Amino acid sequence: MLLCYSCKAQVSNEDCLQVENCTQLGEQCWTARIRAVGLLTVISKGCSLNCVDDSQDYYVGKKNITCCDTDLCNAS
Template identity: 50%
Template sequence: GLFSIISKGCDSSCEESYNNFSVGNRNISCCSTDLCNVNAAGGVRSSYGLAGGIAAGVLWTTLNHKF
């Protein structure tokens, strides 16, 4: 998918799962050590960067063909 939204939290129980949708995915992963999910924030930046690059390319192509 194009978009990945990362939400972090703590819970007393966790069940891992993965769902792939046409425009994004939902991935639940579990960890049990201190600060174990700190590095996951980079995933949002790279996904938004990729989506922004694709959108800019489509817009540029569309504008070039109109003029």
């Protein structure tokens, strides 16, 4: 089992400090960054098998998802 943070629809990093362990080994974690024309910025992360090393075909524009196979890789 891999350990990664878990903060959906969050804009405050100070609050994004909830580390949770995944279900089973093999699953990968990813971090999404949302930054609109304004200043507001959200942060999301997930954990599953379906995690493309690089999301270029989709998940782009405003929200970019970055895959990673490291413990607490979605810490930042």
